[PDB]
Amino acid sequence: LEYPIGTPQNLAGMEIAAVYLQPIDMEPEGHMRKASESDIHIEADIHALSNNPNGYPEGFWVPFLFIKYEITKVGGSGAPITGDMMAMVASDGPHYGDNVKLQGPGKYKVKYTIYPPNAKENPMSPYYGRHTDRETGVRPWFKTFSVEWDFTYAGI
């Protein structure tokens, strides 16, 4: 099932929502930590709002982003749980996600750092372009930013 995380946030003509599901299985295998080695599938749900700066019609999935996440158990002085999401498709459409192993039931904080197509850290920079001519060009890509939420994990 789905376990939404807080309320969606917006920036730069995109809506950013966080949710987790039960761990999933994915092709290509050997990318997702196996479902049996995980507690949840964390996801970032990112869609264009109106007047999107890069030409996306409202509602379109925003592709070719790179998302790094940090999940910290509240009150914990231990190391945060970190990883990189991967772009993928599921029955509900494309999203960014990762299978994650948590640190038991309780309160967590979740931070997503969202990299644009042209960020150094985004491995997809050489594969996705942007028109820059006057007639068909669009605005520059957004700059890297982070968004945070709190959530409770009960065990699924």
Binding site for a copy of itself (CB under 8 A): 21-22, 24-28, 31-32, 35, 54-57, 60-61, 63-64, 86-94, 118, 123-133, 135-138, 140
Judged by DSSP in three states, 125 sits in helix
- How far apart CA 20 and CA 43 sit, in angstroms, is 6
The entry of Cu ion, a copy of itself, none near residue 3 (CB within 5 to 8 angstroms by kind) is none
Total site size for Cu ion, rule CB under 5 A:
2
| CA 48 vs CA 1, 65, 67, 80, 83: distances in Å | 25, 13, 16, 30, 24
Q: Of these, 23, 97, 116, 117, which contacts Cu ion (CB under 5 A)?
A: 97
**Residue 49 interacts with which of a copy of itself, Cu ion, none, CB < 5 to 8 Å by class:** none
**Contacts for 37 with CB less than 8 Å, ≥ 6 apart:** 99, 101
When the beta carbons of 57 and 78 are compared against a copy of itself, the nearer one is 57
- 127 by DSSP, 3-state: which? helix
Q: Is 23 in the site for Cu ion (CB under 5 A)?
A: no
Q: Which of 40, 71, 88, 147 binds Cu ion (CB under 5 A)?
A: 88
